[PDB]
């Protein structure tokens, strides 16, 4: 890798993020706008995505 | 020495909870 | 080859005063510049490698800025340790040229 080397030969940092969609607890969530639970009435619910 | 596996050798297929169903 | 000079003259700002130096390349060296701090009678210390990213073991106050020909270094607060002669070197070419330098005094 050299400054002289062209953009084609220039070094590139690559991060590959691997995600498994599962019915497991799924700790990593990125939560926002969390709400309290409601029961005994019809509602649109998001549980862990 | 060799011993038959009998009905041993099974592990849970997936994380999903299943009740009163037969799953292949 | 590329030639490196520092435009600002010696600045005698006091401790706790923000200061900013400018380094200008003769021709575009992309982001290949290295800011140094040399105390008299001491080895030079590389403040920022390339641009933006601070070098390890360098205080947070020192900052790396400037793209292309223009490069800039800003110190948030001065200290007695900070006063020194600072120098910038182009790394894009195979031969290396160093900056003229700007003296920092109390």
């Amino acid at each position: 890798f050299q400054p002289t080397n062209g953009v084609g030969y220039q070094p590139y940092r690559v991060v590959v993020l691997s995600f498994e969609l599962l019915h497991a607890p799924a700790t990593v969530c990125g939560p926002k706008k969390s709400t309290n639970l409601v029961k005994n009435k019809c509602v649109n619910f998001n549980f862990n995505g | 020495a060799y011993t038959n596996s009998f009905t041993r050798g099974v592990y849970y297929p997936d994380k999903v909870f299943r009740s009163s169903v037969l799953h292949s | 080859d590329i030639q490196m000079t520092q435009s600002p003259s010696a600045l005698s700002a006091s401790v706790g005063d923000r200061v900013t130096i400018s380094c200008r390349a003769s021709q575009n060296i992309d982001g290949f510049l290295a800011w140094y701090q040399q105390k008299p009678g001491k080895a030079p210390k590389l403040l920022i490698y390339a641009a933006s990213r601070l070098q390890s073991g360098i205080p947070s106050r020192f900052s790396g800025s400037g793209s292309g020909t223009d490069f800039t270094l800003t110190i948030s607060s001065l200290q007695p340790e900070d006063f020194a002669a600072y120098y910038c070197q182009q790394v894009y070419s195979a031969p290396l040229t160093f900056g003229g330098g700007t003296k920092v005094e109390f």
């Binding site: - | - | 080859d1 290949f32 510049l33 290295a34 140094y36 040399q38 001491k42 080895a43 030079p44 210390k45 590389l46 490698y49 390339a50 070098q55 390890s56 120098y87 070197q89 790394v91 195979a94 031969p95 290396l96 040229t97 160093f98 900056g99 003229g100 330098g101």
Partner: protein, 115 residues
């Protein structure tokens, strides 16, 4: 920690041959390429030469070109900057720095050279 020390610098007659030594300790000398720099009194720094990690490929500054030679020994972990046809202008404090311009950069304390 990376430690760099310099030696072999002293007062020399004009036109004399003076050779410097760049000590390397605390890191793998063979893997990393080595650079040489000099600081003239009351002046800006001036890069002198570069040697590759294996030492096969070397470049020199225009001022010291065909006058100053650079060599290194992997076993001895030292880079030698041979200086010939020395001049009053050449007088400087020589700093040996490894991997210049990068995160890996380290600077030696230096040894004064006078002509």
């Amino acid at each position: 920690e990376v430690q760099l020390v310099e030696s072999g610098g002293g007062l020399v007659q004009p036109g004399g041959s003076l050779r410097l030594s760049c000590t390397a300790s605390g890191f793998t000398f063979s893997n990393y390429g080595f650079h040489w720099v000099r600081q003239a009194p009351g002046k800006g720094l001036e890069w002198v030469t570069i040697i590759s990690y294996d030492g096969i490929t070397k470049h020199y500054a225009d001022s010291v070109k065909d006058r100053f030679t650079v060599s290194r020994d992997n076993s001895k972990t030292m880079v030698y900057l041979q200086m010939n046809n020395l001049k009053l202008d050449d007088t400087a404090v020589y700093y040996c720095a490894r991997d210049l311009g990068t995160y890996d950069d380290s600077w030696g304390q230096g040894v004064l050279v006078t002509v």
